[PDB]
């Protein structure tokens with residue numbers, strides 16, 4: 001029986017086989033991907049934002065596994081429990097003149113600013129804050145179940161300036177205060193602020209150095225610590241009529257969390273946030289990550305609107321709704337098939353929210369190849385108008401199929417290069433987006449050639465209205481002639497005549513971009529900790545709370561503060577290893593004990609005391625004037641032993657007569673006795689963080705922990721924290737290199753979670769961009785076979801990247817997660833227009849470099865323009881989004897398209913016109 005004897009004949013004779021086979025295996029992917037995997041969860045946006053394989057990361061994971069597994073009959077314990085049990089065997093403020101408790105981070109709260117720029121310390125503003133709370137939080141039908149309660153009659157009062165003024169001036173409520181009460185309260189604040197600054201006022205005094213008037217309910221401490229900004233009542237300009245209260249805070253009796261969701265959505269979300277007197281500038285209801293999932297899915301309307309505009313661009317370009325809608329079916333199918341491969345074939349259990357942005361990327365860059373194949377098909381038709389379909393298909397594929405691949409492969413490879421990241425979310429996103437891009441290419445050389453054959457065979461025969469069709473035809477004709485005159489006549493004259501203007505202008509831009517990126521101001525690393533990471537645009541009240549207001553209120557500053565010294569924690573007997581799955585963020589492994597460890601050896605006892613006394617001589621160590629008896633438990637144990645009075649027979653082994661390097665059996669006996677003496681002799685209680693030995697279920701010491709304070713303070717600056725880490729880790733590693741066996745495998749840990757993230761963002765960006773640059777230059781040598789065209793192309797790609805990244809630096813971008821991925825992807829996208837032109841310069845029949853540049857611009861001009869335009873339009877559609885990630889990706893997509901199109905069309909064609917090869921001058925031998 002009959003069968004097609006070549007691929008071009010399969011497409012030409014049986015296009016319905018190709019579409020039927022594609023449709024069936026796409027339908028299988030769509031079914032199995034919904035039925036078999038567990039569906040994605042976006043309840044935590046920050047989920048994979050952690051380095052896994054790093055030296056610091058494995059130590060941090062190990063220390064967390066030690067802390068969870070430490071406790072009564074757990075894997076490790078602070079106390080020798082099997083020895084210990086053997087010892088045991090032997091409203092109206094004139095009536096209810098109080099608030100229900102102290103305000104805290106546990107309560108729902110809002111930040112006010114003045115609407116007219118006034119000081120907030122005025123009676124209209126003070127009552128307007130109470131009016132907003134009453135009208136927007138309390139009024140809600142759910143509030144009465146959520147509020148903390150002293151009686152069934154009414155909820156507790158909210159912590160607000162007007163209620164503190166009421167209780168200080170014996171008024172019944174915020175609503176019944178007067179200007180005399182406001183000025184009286186201002187005097188009390190102005191005098192007693194020095195007592196608060198000097199640490200003499202405090203939370204419980206209702207303060208022996210402090211006068212009674214401002215002690216009256218702890219009200220002056222509570223106003224200054226919780227309700228007012230840090231510039232109000234600062235020592236400078238305190239003698240001023242009313243000080244500038246820029247911001248003030250209000251606390252609701254509702255506990256901060258997911259119960260606030262209805263109150264927010266009903267009464268805060270759609271509001272204009274202003275009472276005309278005061279504006280609500282910040283909100284902290286505990287719902288930021290709960291709200292994130294809703295907006296993350298709701299904003300998928302913007303990529304859907306982008307699909308319709310890309311359908312319009314491509315319907316006018318190709319002149320069919322058939323080839324156009326079948327191309328957009330293939331674009332959306334490549335996401336569905338990528339998802340089946342990702343969850344079912346590759347077995348990835350975690351789907352980051354970053355993966356939803358691959359719908360934006362594929363809608364922008366998906367049609368690029370359809371514009372190329374449709375052009376080449378029409379050049380092929382025009383060149384040989386009586387060729388049979390199998391010849392026309394084969395010639396079209398011979399001209400198009402490699403350039404379509406190289407532009408796709410450069411962009412997929414730039415995403416797969418992010419699998420070299422230590423950050424789990426970045427690796428997962430690189431795999432998902434790289435796979436969709438390659439699946440889309442396979443459809444553009446299978447599905448789209450068979451669709452083009454079916455159009456020509458049937459639909460090309462079939463295809464006010466009686467004038468509207470004619471009016472449509474004549475305007476479509478005029479648009480196409482205008483497009484042809486531009487790309488064949490207008491644009492080549494502008495490129496060639498002004499070539500010396502272009503060479504000077506685009507070099508000046510490249511030098512400017514290189515100065516901004518490499519000299520000043522450079523791109524910065526992240527400057528907020530991971531819990532404060534921005535998910536919404538900076539306009540959103542939840543983001544202004546974390547970015548602006550957490551640093552202006554004293555209770556939010558002292559939650560960590562400036563005088564945190566870095567701990568130096570040193571651990572033995574546990575292996576610093578992550579045995580969990582690095583691609584599953586929830587898979588932390590199992591705690592591993594080191595079988596070679598021994599503390600109780602006389603050599604181990606002697607060395608570890610000498611290490612403690614060596615470490616105290618270093619410039620990184622901070623001497624507290626009170627001694628830490630926990631820091632080096634061996635010195636405290638030596639001290640206890642040399643105090644045992646030894647006249648009692650029970651003190652026979654644990655005696656002051658013994659010299660310090662005790663025989664191992666006397667160490668193992670007396671350490672248990674000394675630990676059990678402590679919690680009876682003193683009020684001191686050990687916990688899973690406390691330094692000391694760690695016992696197993698057979699009262700055997702399996703680990704030891706030492707801890708010391710550093711002269712280094714805690715900081716979010718990368719270089720200061722790198723200097724701390726290098727100085728301490730080098731000295732500890734060097735000193736441990738001379739430790740006896742059984743102490744040789746110890747390791748150092750500290751508060752280094754954010755420094756490990758910053759370090760991983762630095763390293764992974766440099767590696768992924770170097771891999772992306774290597775692929776970009778390689779594929780251009782292998783596509784042009786000429787070193788001079790490949791060189792002018794990589795110089796234009798370099799100018800594109802310096803102007804693109806230098807522009808993002810002037811826009812205030814930092815090297816965060818996602819921002820770091822776009823830098824790698826910028827290279828792989830920027831390849832594409834210089835490849836399309838560089839192949840058309842070589843293809844040119846003209847002998848002279850001017851004719852070859854006119855040919856190149858004439859033949860690739862409108863396809864390059866349409867690929868740039870569809871990618872720009874997809875990015876421009878993401879600007880109404882609340883999700884920060886959508887708005888950042890669309891910003892990048894617009895910017896990189898303008899810069900890469902201009903450098904490929906003006907700068908790279910001007911290099912080819914001035915000093916381009918002619919007559920095989922730089923041709924690589926095959």
Ligand SMILES: CCCCCCCCCCC(CCCCCCCCCC)(CO[C@@H]1O[C@H](CO)[C@@H](O[C@H]2O[C@H](CO)[C@@H](O)[C@H](O)[C@H]2O)[C@H](O)[C@H]1O)CO[C@@H]1O[C@H](CO)[C@@H](O[C@H]2O[C@H](CO)[C@@H](O)[C@H](O)[C@H]2O)[C@H](O)[C@H]1O
Nearest residue numbers: 295297298299300301302303304307332335359880881882
């Ligand atoms: C691959 C990823 C798959 C993700 C799967 C999860 C999808 C979750 C969908 C969620 C969602 C978007 C729908 C668009 C999705 C496009 C996907 C494109 C995928 C391409 C591969 C469902 O939108 C639904 O739309 C229905 C339309 O028929 C509508 O039906 C109703 O009318 C029928 C007659 O029309 C009638 O018969 C039926 O009885 C009715 O009920 C529903 O009530 C409505 O809930 C949520 O948005 C809904 O609609 C608005 C949208 O703007 C949204 O507007 C706000 O927010 C926008 C955004 O922040 C912002 O822009 C807007 O300014 C802002 O006002 C609304 O607040 C929200 O309510």
Ligand SMILES: CCCCCCCCCCC(CCCCCCCCCC)(CO[C@@H]1O[C@H](CO)[C@@H](O[C@H]2O[C@H](CO)[C@@H](O)[C@H](O)[C@H]2O)[C@H](O)[C@H]1O)CO[C@@H]1O[C@H](CO)[C@@H](O[C@H]2O[C@H](CO)[C@@H](O)[C@H](O)[C@H]2O)[C@H](O)[C@H]1O
Nearest residue numbers: 629630633636637639640674675678681682683684691692
């Ligand atoms: C596994 C890790 C164990 C961690 C232990 C951590 C707790 C410290 C225990 C050690 C301990 C008692 C001995 C108990 C048994 C020890 C078993 C050891 C087991 C080891 C396996 C040693 O007490 C020290 O004894 C020394 C003699 O031995 C003595 O030395 C002197 O003599 C020599 C010159 O004449 C020469 O030595 C040296 O120059 C001299 O100074 C010191 O003055 C004295 O401070 C502490 O005793 C007391 O503890 C109190 C709180 O309970 C603590 O109260 C304060 O701080 C509280 C807040 O913490 C706070 O609330 C209180 O308001 C506040 O008042 C006292 O200030 C402290 O004194």
Ligand SMILES: CC(C)CCC[C@@H](C)[C@H]1CC[C@H]2[C@@H]3CC=C4C[C@@H](OC(=O)CCC(=O)O)CC[C@]4(C)[C@H]3CC[C@]12C
Nearest residue numbers: 013014015016017018019020021022023024025027028
């Ligand atoms: C998920 C669903 C859509 C999967 C099912 C796909 C089917 C609808 C496809 C698969 C193979 C296709 C067939 C493949 C080849 C042909 C031969 C074709 O005719 C010829 O090539 C000319 C024969 C002649 O000499 O007359 C007519 C359509 C037909 C029957 C196709 C009809 C549609 C079929 C059955």
Ligand SMILES: CC(C)CCC[C@@H](C)[C@H]1CC[C@H]2[C@@H]3CC=C4C[C@@H](OC(=O)CCC(=O)O)CC[C@]4(C)[C@H]3CC[C@]12C
Nearest residue numbers: 319320321322323325326328329332455459460462463
């Ligand atoms: C954005 C994605 C989800 C689009 C998915 C499209 C599919 C549902 C396919 C299957 C059947 C296709 C239709 C089959 C036949 C025709 C007739 C065809 O008529 C002509 O050929 C008009 C002139 C021309 O377009 O060249 C126009 C497209 C249309 C409606 C096709 C459009 C695309 C359809 C709806």
Ligand SMILES: CC(C)CCC[C@@H](C)[C@H]1CC[C@H]2[C@@H]3CC=C4C[C@@H](OC(=O)CCC(=O)O)CC[C@]4(C)[C@H]3CC[C@]12C
Nearest residue numbers: 033039040041042043297335336339355356357358359
């Ligand atoms: C990246 C783009 C191109 C689409 C990728 C494949 C889709 C088939 C996935 C991606 C996100 C998924 C959605 C993300 C979140 C949800 C909520 C989820 O349910 C829960 O989260 C329930 C609450 C909980 O688990 O606690 C299941 C449906 C749905 C819409 C998922 C259905 C399948 C979706 C659309």
Ligand SMILES: CC(C)CCC[C@@H](C)[C@H]1CC[C@H]2[C@@H]3CC=C4C[C@@H](OC(=O)CCC(=O)O)CC[C@]4(C)[C@H]3CC[C@]12C
Nearest residue numbers: 394395397398399400401402403405438439441442445
């Ligand atoms: C994971 C998947 C997506 C990888 C897919 C890779 C292929 C699509 C690449 C690899 C090698 C490429 C081929 C290498 C060599 C050629 C010969 C080339 O030149 C000719 O046929 C010579 C005659 C002429 O140019 O007219 C046409 C393109 C083609 C088939 C290339 C098309 C694209 C191919 C098949």
Ligand SMILES: CC(C)CCC[C@@H](C)[C@H]1CC[C@H]2[C@@H]3CC=C4C[C@@H](OC(=O)CCC(=O)O)CC[C@]4(C)[C@H]3CC[C@]12C
Nearest residue numbers: 006007008393394395396397398399401402442445446
């Ligand atoms: C999941 C799988 C199916 C992905 C792999 C798809 C391949 C089977 C496709 C991708 C590109 C295609 C090629 C694109 C271009 C050409 C050139 C074309 O012409 C020549 O080879 C002419 C050579 C000469 O003139 O000497 C023949 C078909 C061929 C090899 C195609 C055959 C089928 C290829 C290799």
Ligand SMILES: CC(C)CCC[C@@H](C)[C@H]1CC[C@H]2[C@@H]3CC=C4C[C@@H](OC(=O)CCC(=O)O)CC[C@]4(C)[C@H]3CC[C@]12C
Nearest residue numbers: 053412413414415416417418419420421771772774775
């Ligand atoms: C493979 C073909 C299609 C060439 C693709 C271009 C290559 C130059 C690049 C693109 C993506 C790169 C890969 C992206 C990520 C990684 C993970 C990286 O992992 C590790 O070093 C740690 C071990 C691990 O986690 O697997 C090893 C190199 C590798 C495979 C890279 C090797 C070089 C690759 C294949």
Ligand SMILES: CC(C)CCC[C@@H](C)[C@H]1CC[C@H]2[C@@H]3CC=C4C[C@@H](OC(=O)CCC(=O)O)CC[C@]4(C)[C@H]3CC[C@]12C
Nearest residue numbers: 309312313314316317375378479480481483484862866
């Ligand atoms: C989203 C809203 C607010 C604005 C959408 C405007 C678009 C519908 C306009 C803007 C630019 C226009 C395009 C400008 C240039 C061209 C190239 C032109 O190319 C050809 O005539 C040559 C085709 C070939 O060589 O075969 C076809 C029309 C097209 C796609 C135009 C179609 C209509 C477009 C996409």
Ligand SMILES: CC(C)CCC[C@@H](C)[C@H]1CC[C@H]2[C@@H]3CC=C4C[C@@H](OC(=O)CCC(=O)O)CC[C@]4(C)[C@H]3CC[C@]12C
Nearest residue numbers: 489490491492493494495497498502898901902903906
């Ligand atoms: C800094 C960015 C905008 C660089 C990327 C785009 C520019 C290279 C474009 C944008 C607007 C263009 C200009 C718009 C209009 C004209 C008038 C035009 O006048 C003629 O007489 C043209 C005659 C012809 O060649 O048909 C000469 C080129 C020029 C300056 C264009 C040169 C190329 C420009 C500067």
Ligand SMILES: CC(C)CCC[C@@H](C)[C@H]1CC[C@H]2[C@@H]3CC=C4C[C@@H](OC(=O)CCC(=O)O)CC[C@]4(C)[C@H]3CC[C@]12C
Nearest residue numbers: 517523524525718762765766773797798801805815823
């Ligand atoms: C080869 C051509 C094609 C492109 C070359 C561009 C690169 C040299 C640029 C682009 C982005 C730059 C990176 C962007 C941000 C940073 C953070 C920076 O970290 C810091 O300590 C900054 C100060 C801080 O905030 O603490 C280290 C360099 C690095 C990786 C930059 C190094 C230089 C890079 C890789």
Ligand SMILES: CC(C)CCC[C@@H](C)[C@H]1CC[C@H]2[C@@H]3CC=C4C[C@@H](OC(=O)CCC(=O)O)CC[C@]4(C)[C@H]3CC[C@]12C
Nearest residue numbers: 309537539540872873874876877878879880881882883
């Ligand atoms: C020609 C095509 C391809 C692009 C058209 C893009 C415009 C329709 C965009 C560009 C900037 C957008 C604006 C940028 C910012 C905002 C603020 C935004 O304010 C919010 O408080 C709600 C959403 C959010 O959280 O950001 C409301 C939409 C709006 C006016 C956007 C409306 C749509 C605009 C005008």
Ligand SMILES: CC(C)CCC[C@@H](C)[C@H]1CC[C@H]2[C@@H]3CC=C4C[C@@H](OC(=O)CCC(=O)O)CC[C@]4(C)[C@H]3CC[C@]12C
Nearest residue numbers: 481482483485486490864865866868869872897898901
């Ligand atoms: C979106 C960013 C990434 C840039 C993408 C490339 C654009 C610079 C291209 C896309 C479509 C092009 C347009 C398509 C058609 C025309 C009509 C053309 O009209 C004539 O030359 C008419 C001459 C006559 O009839 O007298 C003038 C240029 C223009 C606007 C083109 C200018 C270059 C455009 C805007």
Ligand SMILES: CC(C)CCC[C@@H](C)[C@H]1CC[C@H]2[C@@H]3CC=C4C[C@@H](OC(=O)CCC(=O)O)CC[C@]4(C)[C@H]3CC[C@]12C
Nearest residue numbers: 506509803806807808810811895898899900901902903
């Ligand atoms: C086609 C390319 C190669 C040439 C330039 C095209 C321009 C239309 C674009 C591309 C990048 C844009 C720039 C990207 C970033 C910024 C920073 C932006 O903000 C600031 O400078 C804020 C300064 C501060 O707050 O202190 C002002 C506009 C500017 C210079 C943009 C102006 C218009 C530029 C040069």
Ligand SMILES: CC(C)CCC[C@@H](C)[C@H]1CC[C@H]2[C@@H]3CC=C4C[C@@H](OC(=O)CCC(=O)O)CC[C@]4(C)[C@H]3CC[C@]12C
Nearest residue numbers: 781785786787788790917919920921922923924925926
């Ligand atoms: C060794 C490391 C640094 C990797 C180098 C990779 C490429 C940059 C090398 C590999 C082969 C080299 C080519 C081998 C042969 C030639 C032919 C040579 O002469 C001609 O084309 C003109 C001959 C004439 O005079 O007629 C010009 C340099 C070129 C393209 C070489 C330029 C550099 C190439 C592309």
Ligand SMILES: *[C@@H]1O[C@H](CO)[C@@H](O)[C@H](O)[C@H]1NC(C)=O
Nearest residue numbers: 194195197198199200209210
């Ligand atoms: C209050 O401040 C002064 C000046 O800094 C200081 O000398 C004094 O000791 C402080 N008061 C108390 C009770 O410590």
